[PDB]
Design a protein around this nucleic acid. Sequence first.
RNA 1: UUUCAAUGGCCCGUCUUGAAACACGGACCAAGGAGUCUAGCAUCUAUGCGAGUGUUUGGGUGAUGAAAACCCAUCCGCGAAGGUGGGAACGCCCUUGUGGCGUGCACCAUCGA
RNA 2: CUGCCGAAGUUUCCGGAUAGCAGAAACUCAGAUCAGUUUUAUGUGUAAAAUGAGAGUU
RNA 3: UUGAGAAGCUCAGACGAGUAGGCAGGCGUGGAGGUUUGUGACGAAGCCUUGGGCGUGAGCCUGGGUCGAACAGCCUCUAGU
Lengths: 134, 125, 124, 39, 101, 52, 104, 51, 207
Amino acid sequence: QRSKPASENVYLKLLVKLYRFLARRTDSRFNKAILKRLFQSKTNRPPISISKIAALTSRKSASSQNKTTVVVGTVTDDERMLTVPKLSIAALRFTKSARARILKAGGEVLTLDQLALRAPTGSNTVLVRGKKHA
Amino acid sequence: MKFSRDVTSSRRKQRKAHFGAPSSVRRVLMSAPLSKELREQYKIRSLPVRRDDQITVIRGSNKGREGKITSVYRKKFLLLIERVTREKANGASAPVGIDASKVVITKLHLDKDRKDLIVRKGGKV
Amino acid sequence: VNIIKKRTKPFKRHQSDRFKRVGESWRKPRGIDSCVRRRFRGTISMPKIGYGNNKKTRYCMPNGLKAFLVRNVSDVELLLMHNKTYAAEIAGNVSARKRVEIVEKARALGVKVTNAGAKVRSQE
Amino acid sequence: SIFAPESLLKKTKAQKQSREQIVAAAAEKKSARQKKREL
Amino acid sequence: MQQDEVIWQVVGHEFCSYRIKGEAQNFCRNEYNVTGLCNRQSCPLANSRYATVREDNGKLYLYMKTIERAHFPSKLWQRIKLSKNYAKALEQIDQQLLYWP
Amino acid sequence: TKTWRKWHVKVNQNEKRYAIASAVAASGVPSLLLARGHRIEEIPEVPLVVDD
Amino acid sequence: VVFNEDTGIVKAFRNIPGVEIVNVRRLNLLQLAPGGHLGRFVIWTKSAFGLLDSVFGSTTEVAQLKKNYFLPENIISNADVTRLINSDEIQSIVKAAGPSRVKR
Amino acid sequence: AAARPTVSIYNKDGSVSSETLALPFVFKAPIRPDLVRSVHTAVAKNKRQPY
Amino acid sequence: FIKKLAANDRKTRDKALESLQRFLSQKKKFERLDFLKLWKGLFYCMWMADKPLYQQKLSDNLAALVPIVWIDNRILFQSTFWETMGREWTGIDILRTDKFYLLMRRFCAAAFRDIQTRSKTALLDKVVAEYNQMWMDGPFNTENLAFPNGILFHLADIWTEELRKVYPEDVPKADWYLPFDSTIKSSHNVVLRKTLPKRLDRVSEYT
RNA sequence: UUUCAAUGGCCCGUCUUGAAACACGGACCAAGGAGUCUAGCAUCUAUGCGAGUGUUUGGGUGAUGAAAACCCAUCCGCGAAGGUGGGAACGCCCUUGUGGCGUGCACCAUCGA
RNA sequence: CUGCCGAAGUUUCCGGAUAGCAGAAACUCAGAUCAGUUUUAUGUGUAAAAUGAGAGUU
RNA sequence: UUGAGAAGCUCAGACGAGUAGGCAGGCGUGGAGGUUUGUGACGAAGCCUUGGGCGUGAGCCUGGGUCGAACAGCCUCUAGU
C-alpha cells in the first residue's frame, strides 16, 4: 500500500533511500519499522515533547544508562519543566528551543542518518511515538 | 532601457505616434546621414532632408546612383530623386521613392537657417 | 526481437465515415444503448491495452531503428554511440543549408538519417 | 606508486571470506546431494 | 556544497538544461557524457569523479575530473592525449583510470 | 472575467527566507549553474568573488 | 552581480545584456531562482560576501539584520547517501548480497 | 557538513589575491527544488495586473 | 598560519607545511585548543589534496609531523587528530574517504614508531601504558557515543598490520591490544562490540 | 488507394421503456458554444515554524518598472487552561532454536482518577 | 485518450435517518479466526471432524 | 557483465465484461517565468495530399505541392483550453 512517501522534502527521499537499503539488507525489525514510519503522513507523525521523552527513558526503574531515543517526527520542548536530563535523541526535526535545551545541559541531538551509522540494526534504541489522538 | 515615465515603450502607442504625426513632426522623422568627410567637417551626425540636397542612394535597387532631392513627400515618408525613375506602361517615368534614412547627404543646400542649425548643435562650417 | 506489430490498420471513430463534421480521431462512444460500444458482431474494434506492442520493440521503425529528432547539427553528434538503434530524423523546418550539414556529418558519424533527401539535390 | 584505495582492501577481504564460505559449503552440499539422490 | 546526491536530485529530476525528452530514453546534450544518454551513472554533473573520451581536431583526448577540483570550473577537467596506436591507447586509459570503477 | 479574482498569493516569511537561503546556497554549486544553462565552464572559481 | 554599495556599479553593468545587479540586502527569488530553477550564476563582491554572514545568519547564531532568524536545520547532515550506505559501519553488518539480476 | 572553508578574491586585473573569506553559513543550507518552486510559483504572481 | 593551510591553491598550502616545521618544534607547552584549531587547518589541508600520488605523499608528510613535535606534547598532538578525525568523519564523502583511511593508517603507524623511539629512553611498559591512556580518553572511550565505528573498525583492521611494520624483527610483550579488550568488554555500542573481534587480527603469541 | 469476391453488420444522441417499442432532436459544412470566478466551512495531503503561530491595516525601504522584492513597530486573531495485563521496538541470554528474563511506545483493556 | 476497482438496483424502522453493497484509511493478528460448506453426534435446531480460505475490527 | 534515470534494472505467478460511481497516468490548445549558446527568405505558421513512419489511444514525427514571416521541444506557472 504505502511504499513511496507523499512528501517532496528531497532530503526525506534520501533518508528513505538509506532505510530502504537497511530494511531489506538486515534482519532487524527496527529498520522495517523505521522505513514504514518515514512513509506516514504529517498527521500520523505527532510531535513528541521533550518532557514525554524525559519521562520515558527515566521511567519506573530509571536506569537510563546511555540508550538513544529515536522518533520519526519533531521533538518540541516543554518549558513547563525546568531541569532537562541528559539525553541522546534522534529525530527528523527538532525545534531550536528544544535542540538548544538538549545540547546545553546533557548529551546530544542526532538526525536519523547519525543514528543509522551508529546503530544500523537498532542496537539499544528506544523507538517512541507522540500521542496520536491530538 | 527607458527610465522616464515621460516616454513610452508601446508598439501600439509608438506606431500611433509615427503615423499620426503631422508634417512639422515628420520633418524630423525624415532625417539623413552625412558623408563621412562632411560629417566630421561640421561635427554633426545627421540632418533632416531638404529639397535641392545632393545625395547618394545606399540601399535598394537604386544603390549607388546619386542625384538631388526634387521634393520631399512627407505624407508617405519618401524622397523623390531626379533621374531615379521607373518606366511605367505608357513609357512615362513614375519616379520611385527612397526613404530618408537610406540615402546619404553629400552636398547640403546651405540656407541661413541651416547654418544656424549647424552652429546651434555645437558645430561649425 | 524483430519489429512485429499486433495490428496495422488505424482505429477510426465510429460513424466517422458517414459524417464530415465527425473527425476520424478515435473518440470513445459513450452512448448508453450504443451496440457498437457493446462489442457486437460486424462492428468495429476499440483500443485496448491488449493491443500494445513488445516493450523492446515499441517506437521501432520497420527496419529496427527508433526515430530520433535532430534539430541542428549538435543533436546529430550525440547519436554517436546509439547509431545501431536510433535514426536521425531531421526536423521539418530545418533549412536546406543546415540540412546538408546534418547529412554530411551524420554520414561520417555512421548514423542513419531517415529524411536525408529532402529539399536538397545531388550534383556530380 | 598508488597503493590501491583501502576502501577496496576492505571489500576484497569481505568477498574473499564470503567466497571461501560458499566454496567450502559447496563440497558438503554436493556430497549430500548424491546421498539424497540415492535415498 | 558538492554532493552527488542532492545535485542529482535537482538535475536528474527537476530540471537540467541538457536533457532531451525522448520517446523511450532521455539524451544528454552535455559535452562530457561518455554515453550520450541522461542516466545516473552517465551524467557528468552528479558524478563528482568522472572520465570521458572526446576528440578535439582529429586527436582523441581523455578528459578527467575529480571531486577535489570540482569547485574551480577553469581547472576542473584534466586532459591527456591518447595515442594513435589503439593498443597503446587502451594501456593509457587503464594506467590513468586505474582503481576507478 | 471578474477583477476581484485572486491575483496575489501569500507565503509565510519563514517560507520565503528558506526558499531564498536555499536559492543562495545553490548558487555556489557549479553543477547547478551549468545545469541551468550558465556558460561558466571557464570561471576561475565558484562562488565568484571580486574585490570592492 | 551582488554588490554592497552603489557608487557606479549599477550604472556600469546595467546595459550589458542579461547582467542583473541586485543589492545583498534585498536578494529576490525571481533573480536567484529564475523560472523556479535553482542555480543562478552570481558574481559577488568582497563587501557583499562579507555581509552574507549577517544577512542570513547561521544555524546557531542569528542574522543581525533579520531579527530572530536562524537558518534552516536539515533532515540529515551528510546529504550524500552513497556514502551513508557504502560505509563500513553499515556494510559490515548487512547480510549477504544476492545477485543484481537473478537468472531465469 | 564539511566543505571548502575559504574562497579567493579576484582583483580587477583577474589575478588572484592572497586574502580569503570563510564560506558563509548560508552556503550550506538545504537545497530544495520543490520548496523554491512552490515559493517562486507564488511570489511571481505578485506583480500582476487585473483584467 | 591556520588560514593559509586551507588555501585554495597548493602552491600556498604546501608552503604552510614547512612554515609549520618550526612551529611544531616549539619548546613550550601547547594547550589542547591550539592543536584542535591547528588540526582543522591540517584536516582541510588534506581535504583538497587532489592527485593520488600527491595525496599519499602528504599523508607521509603529516605522519612525519609526529616525531618532530616536542616530546611533552606529542601525545596531545596525536590525541587531537583522533578527536578531530572522529567528529568530521561523517562529513567526508566516498571519494574523499580513501585518503583519510590512509591518513589514519599512516598516523596509527606513526604512534607505534614513537613507542619504539621512546622505548630506547624510558621503560617500554611505561610509555605504552601512557599511549594506552591516550586511547582510553579518546577514540576508545565508552563514555562518548559521538565516535564513529568506521574508524574503530579501521583501527582494529590495521592495528597489528602496522605493528609488524614498526617492529620488523619482533614485538616485545606489552598491552598493545588493551584498547580493544577494554572496548569489547564494556562498550555500550553492542554492534561495535559484537563485530569488533570478527575484523580484528589479534594474536597472543607475544602478548 | 479504388474496386471486386466470400462472410457479415437494423440510424446516431437524448428520453422512454427490464428491454425494446418508442416519441423526439438531426439538410450539409465552418467557426462560436456550457462546473466557472469569488467569500465561508469541514476533510485529506504537502511545506514553514512549533507552545506557539500569522511580514503585506500601516510604516521603513526599493536609482537597473519602483504596483515587485526586502525589512519590523504597536496591537490583534487563532491556540495554550497512578498501578494491572495486552501490546511496537530493543537488550540480556541459552537448549542456542524454542522460548525465557526483562525494558515497555501508539493504544486498548482494566482498576483509575 | 487509456488503466484499475465497480455496485446497489432495498432490507429495516420511517420525505428522511439506518442498514447493506462498493470503496478509502487506521489498527491485530495467520500459534486467528472463519465459510449462501459438508459431516459427526447430542436433543429440524444445536454442539463438536473434514474440505478450503489468513481472518477480524474502528 | 558493465543492468545506480533505486523515480532504475531484474525475476516470478495469477488475472483482464461493465452502467451509476470511485481512483490513476497521460494527450492536446492559448498565454507566462526558465531553457534548447532551438528553427526560420537556402522558407516560420498555416493548408491540401491514395507519400513514409510512431503510439493500444488521445495524438505525433516526417516527404511532396501551395505558402510567405514567424515558430517550437523540454521543466514549471496559468486559464475565456
